[PDB]
Amino acid sequence: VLSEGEWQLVLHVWAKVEADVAGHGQDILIRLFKSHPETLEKFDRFKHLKTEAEMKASEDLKKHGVTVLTALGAILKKKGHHEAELKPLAQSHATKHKIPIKYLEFISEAIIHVLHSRHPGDFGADAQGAMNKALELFRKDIAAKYKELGYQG
Numbered sequence: 001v002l003s004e005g006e007w008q009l010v011l012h013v014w015a016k017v018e019a020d021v022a023g024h025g026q027d028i029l030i031r032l033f034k035s036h037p038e039t040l041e042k043f044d045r046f047k048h049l050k051t052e053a054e055m056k057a058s059e060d061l062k063k064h065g066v067t068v069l070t071a072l073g074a075i076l077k078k079k080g081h082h083e084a085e086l087k088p089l090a091q092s093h094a095t096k097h098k099i100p101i102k103y104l105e106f107i108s109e110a111i112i113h114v115l116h117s118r119h120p121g122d123f124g125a126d127a128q129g130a131m132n133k134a135l136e137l138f139r140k141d142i143a144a145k146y147k148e149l150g151y152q153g
């Protein structure tokens, strides 16, 4: 469980992400795809992209980056009370898209990397730790739903 203090650190840097949702989403998905190429292959929408420059030039990739961070922002602002936000996400990612929890760990690492890059003054180690705990909490609750549905990772 995160403390109120931890949630404030998390939401303080997230309100900054929201000044440029699309540029953060681009950076995060490109980081994820470059560092873990198995993740790109899960997207029929994006698997034609072969270079970083092509990824940066894709307007559809930018569009989906906003979809992803908008969903994640709505989750974080619930401060743990996110059961209704996670249900449909867990269901689709386990059963339709087939995304292992490990790949949620990968995108969590890409988020932290990009938040550190763009917001160092509001993403010191205390805020890094808090954001890690919030993304861990996300993964834990999704993982419980995956397990229910018989999917792994």
Ligand code: 7HE
Pocket (backbone or CB within 6 Å): 038, 039, 040, 042, 043, 044, 045, 067, 068, 069, 071, 072, 089, 093, 097, 099, 103, 104, 107
């Ligand atoms: C490695 C792949 C992977 C990973 C790590 C995620 N997803 Fe998902 N995603 C999400 C929304 C709202 C939608 C319509 C999809 C659609 C998707 C779709 C459908 C894309 C489409 O073809 O339109 C795919 C394949 C999918 N997502 C692969 C995907 C949100 C998330 C969130 C909040 C996370 C974690 C922070 C996430 N995805 C990680």
